[PDB]
Amino acid sequence: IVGGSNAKEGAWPWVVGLYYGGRLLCGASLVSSDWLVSAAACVYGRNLEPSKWTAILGLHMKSNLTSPQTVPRLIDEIVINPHYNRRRKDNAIAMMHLEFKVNYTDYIQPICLPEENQVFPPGRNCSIAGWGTVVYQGTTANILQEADVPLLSNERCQQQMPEYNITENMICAGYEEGGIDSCQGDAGGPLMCQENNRWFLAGVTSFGYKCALPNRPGVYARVSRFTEWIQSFLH
Amino acid sequence: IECLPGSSPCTDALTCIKADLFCDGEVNCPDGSDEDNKMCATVCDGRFLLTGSSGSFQATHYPKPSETSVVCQWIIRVNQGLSIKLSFDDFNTYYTDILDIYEGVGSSKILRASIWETNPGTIRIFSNQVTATFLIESDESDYVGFNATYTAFNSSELNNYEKINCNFEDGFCFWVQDLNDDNEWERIQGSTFSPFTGPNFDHTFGNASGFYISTPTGPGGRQERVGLLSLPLDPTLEPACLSFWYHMYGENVHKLSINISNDQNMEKTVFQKEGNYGDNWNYGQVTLNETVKFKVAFNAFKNKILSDIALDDISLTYGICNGSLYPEPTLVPTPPPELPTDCGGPFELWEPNTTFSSTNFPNSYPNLAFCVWILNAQKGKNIQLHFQEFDLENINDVVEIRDGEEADSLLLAVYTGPGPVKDVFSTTNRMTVLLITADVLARGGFKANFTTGYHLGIPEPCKADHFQCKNGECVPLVNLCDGHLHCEDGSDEADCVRFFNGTTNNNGLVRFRIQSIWHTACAENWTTQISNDVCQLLGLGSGNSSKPIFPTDGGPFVKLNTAPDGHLILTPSQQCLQDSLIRLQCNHKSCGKKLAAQDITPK
Amino acid sequence: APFDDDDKIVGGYNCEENSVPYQVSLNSGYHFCGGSLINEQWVVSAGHCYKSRIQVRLGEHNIEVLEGNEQFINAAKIIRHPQYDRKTLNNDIMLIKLSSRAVINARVSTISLPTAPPATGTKCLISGWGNTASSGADYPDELQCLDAPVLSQAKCEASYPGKITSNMFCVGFLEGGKDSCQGDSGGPVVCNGQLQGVVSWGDGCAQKNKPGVYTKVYNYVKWIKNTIAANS
Ligand SMILES: *[C@@H]1O[C@H](CO)[C@@H](O[C@@H]2O[C@H](CO)[C@@H](O[C@@H]3O[C@H](CO)[C@@H](O)[C@H](O[C@H]4O[C@H](CO)[C@@H](O)[C@H](O)[C@@H]4O)[C@@H]3O)[C@H](O)[C@H]2NC(C)=O)[C@H](O)[C@H]1NC(C)=O
Ligand SMILES: *[C@@H]1O[C@H](CO)[C@@H](O[C@@H]2O[C@H](CO)[C@@H](O[C@@H]3O[C@H](CO[C@H]4O[C@H](CO)[C@@H](O)[C@H](O)[C@@H]4O)[C@@H](O)[C@H](O)[C@@H]3O)[C@H](O)[C@H]2NC(C)=O)[C@H](O)[C@H]1NC(C)=O
Ligand SMILES: *[C@@H]1O[C@H](CO)[C@@H](O[C@@H]2O[C@H](CO[C@@H]3O[C@H](CO)[C@@H](O)[C@H](O[C@H]4O[C@H](CO)[C@@H](O)[C@H](O)[C@@H]4O)[C@@H]3O)[C@@H](O)[C@H](O)[C@H]2NC(C)=O)[C@H](O)[C@H]1NC(C)=O
Ligand SMILES: *[C@@H]1O[C@H](CO)[C@@H](O[C@@H]2O[C@H](CO)[C@@H](O[C@@H]3O[C@H](CO)[C@@H](O)[C@H](O)[C@@H]3O)[C@H](O)[C@H]2NC(C)=O)[C@H](O)[C@H]1NC(C)=O
């Protein structure tokens, strides 16, 4: 995807890979002991047969999976956010059920949803993850890819990217000069910010116009307004 | 004198030359030992240098099966300026053998000729030296391989008529493959591989028994260049007429051009075709006029598969061209690209119209379909859409159901793939049905009755109290927030404990619902374990310090007690007067604290 | 010029055929045909791919990018079916013998010989470098694994009137020139985890109407065993 960096061993315990038919396709965040939050676009149309979705929690590399640090689970129920339209690729948020219960350990850690009346300032440089590729026309990297990108306000993103509606339902994060990007490829990782050693879920990554293209930041799905919807299923 | 490994000495043992250079065709040893007949043990017939103008040669073991893989090579040498004609009578072999005929020796042995599994007939080489190699790559004793005869003839006594006229039934006649091409025009008897492109029969004979030339039949994945160069033609006082038959049937047919190369380096190409013209031989007739010697070049840029081009029945006749008896070729029709867009979709559906299909269920639905159904009914009703048959595709198209009553439609269900699908209910009287399909794999479609009702998807309630859960199971007091699960949805454990008069999720007064009435919790028996239990029941974090502030409920407040089963004992007894009520003070949940190796950039 | 894969979309197909050991390619300077490795030194491929020299690439993750997990083997002998017809491409199946035994690894292995004929509606996978692009027909650097059910024998015969025999079965359905099974001239066709056929020919690169033709291998099980015994 050009610009990404390999994540450290166990540096992202809140990222769980998803396999459909034996191939990694998307990622998700561990919100509770029985729920995962992933992009709705990468799982749209495949929710009719949850048995074909296998969730590997604590996934670091695709070389091996039968390790104590990795928790395999079978998805039973998939819920798609009603506001998703697939026309403007907005509100691409979906939830998956992890059987009955999931424990927690060093390599399996939960995630933090945004609090009430929490606003991310523009220009805030937050981290993104996902198993991206070295280049768009290349092979998917075997090591988890991480990057740091600054946030962009919706008003400025409309002027910089007059291609999608975007609006306030999703937030643009990236570099106006390009160079570093991880939205493309089979990453499926979430955009995460820093809140004084508290890993708040800033958002879920989504479609990108072009990797490392200047003035084309990754338009990731904002989850601040969808915190109540997630907590409704969680609680 | 000794030679390094990989090289061998000559007969005189004075010069060391590479093993691959032995018997190649060019003299390397000072005495010519590398081309000597005795040194080059042909085994086939014992002769290596065919200095004679005519003769015969046979493959390995003419009367015996070829149990041993023996490679044979012959060099035919004649006077300078004379051509050599090779006649082949039988080449019906079960492959595993390679017959290579090369014009000249040395760097000219690249792509002159390569014939296998088919009798080449007559092959003419316009050089004083001809190399014939029979290579056996395995110990296969199916056939001897060939038995041919050769002669010689002058290369320039031929007039313009003979040098061009060729039915290709007995080889390439006098045409010479261009050495600058990336490949060569393969000779095929009958239909070629990869059908639906290229000719299926020979033009000269009219059936598959004939022989013609065309592009290579292999599934080449790269663009190459091929070309046929004609012999020089002496100038004539009258312009001539060139007639030919060309077969251009294929989706990726790039180009096919005819050029004239002369001493003036001036090209005035008069014939050029491109695209698909159909599975039929088209007649091309042109008039040639020139004052000096010139060569006619048939050039073709071969594209990927489905780009086969064939040529047959090429001739040149002295005199001005007569009236052509065949029309100009016509391009193969293609699907119209004039704004295909979509199918538009049907109109709005109402109560009287119930049964509907995508476009036409029995046959198929048009590609790039975006059918929109606006299901509406009477106010206060809901829509049930049960599908009698659902035989869509995989991850190509998907039927989407959107809740109406507003512009911001709410997704209800996405259906795809073969097999029956469950019924879908709407929360209002307006529903949107979208058929999102690509331009490929358009199956029969779906079909639904589109029924209407009142609370069709709502589970049936029970009258006369009988408290119901989300699924509708009657749980008045059996499963009323007591840790017992009976409801299918698991809603029997709903939040019967909450916080009131609070500015946030961790502020206010804790209230418990015993059966149907909320009562506050007193501070008579408040402990750290009870605080942690309250935090857990309210979905909170660590049970930090909390103290009572002021009471609000002076009636039968709920007293909290500890129990071994992990459930707080609630006593609805007023054991104290004006007792201060505990104010909820709990920490945030133990979320994903950064205990990993993730770094923070201080910029 | 935005990229086609704007989101986390692989096009709906298993790109590069991850964990697919039964898919091998035939190279002689370029990619022309595919095949299925059935034994340590036996590859089933389309019978029209024969040429002077053939190289076999096993476990090739990418055709244009060498990941280092592929193996190159010089082919020894190629045998075509004795009843192979060039005009109609009937019995378009051939067997290639490897000069060296295949090395079993994660992406290189042997698939068991089939024991049952294909059935209608069977969940089957077609592996090969299919034409996966937004527009046009071209071989990409990735690999396609299409999940397509096997069509009925009567439907297969109706698709090609007079061009389908008892050794031909159809997996492609409907029509369309976009991402599909396409050609590749010998793409493995494996149903229920067992090899069932190869891609022989079709109406071009699925331009319209009939997608393509697949030649069975169950009818040639005795022939395959005889060839293995004679060319062990
Ligand atoms: C395919 O189309 C061709 C186009 O005409 C069609 O004709 C066949 O051509 C071949 C050779 O081109 C013929 O085979 C030989 O042709 C020579 C030509 O002079 C004849 O002299 C041969 O006959 C000799 O041998 C006979 C043996 O008894 C003697 O009795 C006779 O007197 C001759 O000495 C020999 O026929 C072939 O005969 C023709 N066929 C016809 C029907 O004319 C060819 O038939 C087509 N193939 C198909 C439709 O399968
Ligand atoms: C339910 O599905 C139907 C199937 O297409 C929809 O089409 C309706 O079909 C009926 C039956 O033929 C048509 O009734 C006809 O009406 C004409 C007269 O109307 C025409 O002229 C007026 C102007 O005077 C114009 O406004 C109309 O649009 C018509 O062009 C009679 O002459 C016929 O004999 C026959 O009775 C309906 O007109 C037709 N509606 C259409 C095409 O919109 C039907 O609409 C569906 N019901 C809904 C959507 O509620
Ligand atoms: C048969 O004869 C025809 C003659 O009609 C041959 O056509 C060839 O046509 C080209 C014309 O294309 C362009 O011509 C320019 C001159 O007018 C030439 O400069 C172009 O080359 C480059 O030009 C610029 C500057 O370098 C560069 O930016 C371009 O990208 C381009 O690459 C271009 O060729 C003519 O030039 C050829 O000379 C001519 N060939 C001839 C006369 O032999 C046709 O190829 C012939 N077919 C054969 C030989 O098989
Ligand atoms: C996940 O964590 C738990 C502890 O946090 C691991 O141990 C499990 O703990 C529960 C809770 O006490 C045990 O349930 C108990 O079982 C005993 C019988 O052994 C029963 O008498 C009690 O009434 C209570 O039901 C459970 O047995 C115990 N072991 C399990 C679940 O295997 C648990 O092992 C952790 N799981 C994983 C996958 O790491």
Ligand SMILES: *[C@@H]1O[C@H](CO)[C@@H](O[C@@H]2O[C@H](CO)[C@@H](O[C@@H]3O[C@H](CO)[C@@H](O)[C@H](O)[C@@H]3O)[C@H](O)[C@H]2NC(C)=O)[C@H](O)[C@H]1NC(C)=O
């Ligand atoms: C093999 O054929 C060639 C044909 O080119 C014979 O060479 C001689 O070639 C010339 C053409 O260059 C023929 O035409 C003659 O040209 C001269 C001018 O050089 C002209 O003065 C004559 O009036 C005549 O037009 C010439 O006829 C031809 N010689 C022949 C046919 O004897 C070559 O001789 C032939 N080989 C043999 C062994 O005969």
Ligand SMILES: *[C@@H]1O[C@H](CO[C@@H]2O[C@H](CO)[C@@H](O[C@@H]3O[C@H](CO)[C@@H](O)[C@H](O)[C@@H]3O)[C@H](O)[C@H]2NC(C)=O)[C@@H](O)[C@H](O)[C@H]1NC(C)=O
């Ligand atoms: C291949 O064709 C050649 C065609 O060139 C034409 O040649 C004629 C004469 O042969 C020219 O006519 C001349 O025109 C002059 C005015 O420009 C007159 O002054 C003169 O008397 C004569 O009529 C004609 O112009 C010319 N065409 C052009 C476009 O210039 C021909 O010359 C070659 O002989 C012929 N080659 C053969 C037949 O082998």
Ligand SMILES: *[C@@H]1O[C@H](CO[C@@H]2O[C@H](CO)[C@@H](O[C@@H]3O[C@H](CO)[C@@H](O)[C@H](O)[C@@H]3O)[C@H](O)[C@H]2NC(C)=O)[C@@H](O)[C@H](O)[C@H]1NC(C)=O
């Ligand atoms: C109830 O919660 C108590 C938590 O009080 C606060 O906890 C935060 C930790 O998130 C403290 O922040 C730290 O402050 C240090 C300096 O005192 C810094 O060096 C450090 O980096 C971090 O910022 C905060 O100080 C603390 N507040 C006070 C007033 O101490 C906790 O301490 C209690 O144990 C817990 N339980 C009970 C029964 O009180």
Ligand SMILES: *[C@@H]1O[C@H](CO[C@@H]2O[C@H](CO)[C@@H](O[C@@H]3O[C@H](CO)[C@@H](O)[C@H](O)[C@@H]3O)[C@H](O)[C@H]2NC(C)=O)[C@@H](O)[C@H](O)[C@H]1NC(C)=O
């Ligand atoms: C948002 O992503 C950041 C990308 O890093 C920036 O890269 C530039 C390259 O020039 C660094 O520039 C150097 O900056 C020095 C001061 O830091 C200058 O003295 C030096 O000449 C050159 O300009 C730049 O430092 C580097 N980071 C920054 C912003 O300094 C990343 O590093 C950012 O931290 C991340 N954004 C935020 C909010 O910090």
Ligand SMILES: *[C@@H]1O[C@H](CO[C@@H]2O[C@H](CO[C@@H]3O[C@H](CO)[C@@H](O)[C@H](O)[C@@H]3O)[C@@H](O)[C@H](O)[C@H]2NC(C)=O)[C@@H](O)[C@H](O)[C@H]1NC(C)=O
């Ligand atoms: C249109 O909707 C039909 C719905 O099926 C309908 O089912 C009716 C039920 O039969 C009754 O069953 C009772 C309990 O078993 C029994 O006591 C009573 O005697 C009846 O047998 C049946 O009566 C209707 O005829 C039947 N509808 C039709 C059209 O046959 C659905 O099956 C159909 O697919 C829908 N159409 C489309 C295009 O989807």
Ligand SMILES: *[C@@H]1O[C@H](CO)[C@@H](O[C@@H]2O[C@H](CO)[C@@H](O)[C@H](O)[C@H]2NC(C)=O)[C@H](O)[C@H]1NC(C)=O
């Ligand atoms: C997508 O963006 C366009 C502008 O690029 C929005 O159009 C504006 O909509 C607002 C209110 O909806 C109007 O007041 C403006 O006049 C519109 N035109 C402009 C700003 O040029 C459009 O609304 C956006 N889509 C959605 C769903 O909000």
Ligand SMILES: *[C@@H]1O[C@H](CO)[C@@H](O)[C@H](O)[C@H]1NC(C)=O
């Ligand atoms: C699995 O792969 C990881 C990747 O680095 C490696 O560290 C580990 O040793 C492997 N084995 C186990 C049992 O985790």
Ligand SMILES: *[C@@H]1O[C@H](CO)[C@@H](O)[C@H](O)[C@H]1NC(C)=O
């Ligand atoms: C063409 O016309 C000329 C002159 O009328 C005539 O002699 C000849 O027979 C015709 N046919 C051919 C093939 O040349």
Ligand SMILES: *[C@@H]1O[C@H](CO)[C@@H](O)[C@H](O)[C@H]1NC(C)=O
């Ligand atoms: C808490 O709020 C309720 C509103 O329902 C009010 O009746 C009650 O007096 C409040 N208690 C306070 C402010 O102590």
